Scaffold this motif. Structure first.
Motif, PDB file in Angstrom:
ATOM      1  N   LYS A   2      -0.119  12.291  -8.731  1.00  0.00           N
ATOM      2  CA  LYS A   2      -0.792  13.997  -8.348  1.00  0.00           C
ATOM      3  C   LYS A   2       0.798  15.406  -8.821  1.00  0.00           C
ATOM      4  N   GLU A   5       0.525   4.363  -2.614  1.00  0.00           N
ATOM      5  CA  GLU A   5       0.219   5.334  -2.281  1.00  0.00           C
ATOM      6  C   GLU A   5       1.250   6.630  -3.186  1.00  0.00           C
ATOM      7  N   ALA A   6       2.059   5.999  -3.088  1.00  0.00           N
ATOM      8  CA  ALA A   6       3.264   7.078  -3.714  1.00  0.00           C
ATOM      9  C   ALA A   6       3.111   7.123  -5.215  1.00  0.00           C
ATOM     10  N   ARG A  14       0.257   6.934  -6.465  1.00  0.00           N
ATOM     11  CA  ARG A  14      -1.303   8.179  -6.608  1.00  0.00           C
ATOM     12  C   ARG A  14      -0.313   9.552  -5.848  1.00  0.00           C
ATOM     13  N   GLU A  15       0.260   9.124  -5.177  1.00  0.00           N
ATOM     14  CA  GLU A  15       1.263  10.890  -5.025  1.00  0.00           C
ATOM     15  C   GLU A  15       2.504  11.078  -5.932  1.00  0.00           C
ATOM     16  N   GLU A  72       0.737  -1.449   0.087  1.00  0.00           N
ATOM     17  CA  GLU A  72      -0.263  -0.116  -0.354  1.00  0.00           C
ATOM     18  C   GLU A  72       0.819   1.169  -0.366  1.00  0.00           C
ATOM     19  N   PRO A  73       1.934   1.294   0.013  1.00  0.00           N
ATOM     20  CA  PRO A  73       3.256   2.522   0.510  1.00  0.00           C
ATOM     21  C   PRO A  73       4.077   3.104  -1.257  1.00  0.00           C
TER      22      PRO A  73
END
Length: 165
Positions: A81, A74-75, A77-78, A70-71
């Motif tokens: 962005k 999440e990275a 997705r970041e 999950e990190p």
């Protein structure tokens, strides 16, 4: 003959344009796996070089990458962005090829709107206004012919009739 825009720019580097661009993208994912460096690298099969239509992709095809925690997502997705942000910046910089500098806003009687309009007309440097007639600087959104003429007189006075540099 093909109807599509042809591009031939490179001469020796990026000559293949399909293989040399495949494994040279370190500037894009410069901070992709920010958790730890010994996790993985971006792939060539999917490409990871779009960053526009890749923001929304189902989890049906992302299993083939080893070490998917999950990190990691999440990275991802970041970084998507951040790529959206930098792409919007590149767009807002590339679409507006006007850049009204300080010498363009220092004229008396022009706000941001008139400056942008006169820069989009085709002139952006102070010494090149004297060669633009009254009808040349006409059809401006929010500029009377008399006011345009008066601003032309003012420009030619401060630049040409003033005899200063």
């Amino acid at each position: 003959l093909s109807g599509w825009e042809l591009n031939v720019m490179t001469v020796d580097d990026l000559q293949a344009k399909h293989q040399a661009e495949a494994h040279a993208a370190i500037d894009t994912f410069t901070k992709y796996l920010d958790i730890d460096e010994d996790f993985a690298t971006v792939l060539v099969e999917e490409g990871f070089s779009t960053l526009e239509e890749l923001a929304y992709v189902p989890m049906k095809e992302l299993l083939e990458i080893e070490g998917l925690d999950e990190p990691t997502v999440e990275a991802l997705r970041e970084r998507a962005k951040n790529a959206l942000a930098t792409i919007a910046q590149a767009q807002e910089e590339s679409l507006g090829d006007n850049k009204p500098a300080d010498d363009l806003l220092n004229l008396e009687g022009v706000d941001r709107d008139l400056a942008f309009k006169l820069a989009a007309r085709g002139v952006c440097t102070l010494e090149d206004l004297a060669e633009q007639g009254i009808d040349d600087l006409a059809d401006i959104e929010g500029l009377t012919d008399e006011k345009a003429g008066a601003l032309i007189m003012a420009a030619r006075n401060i630049c040409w009739f003033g005899d200063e540099a």
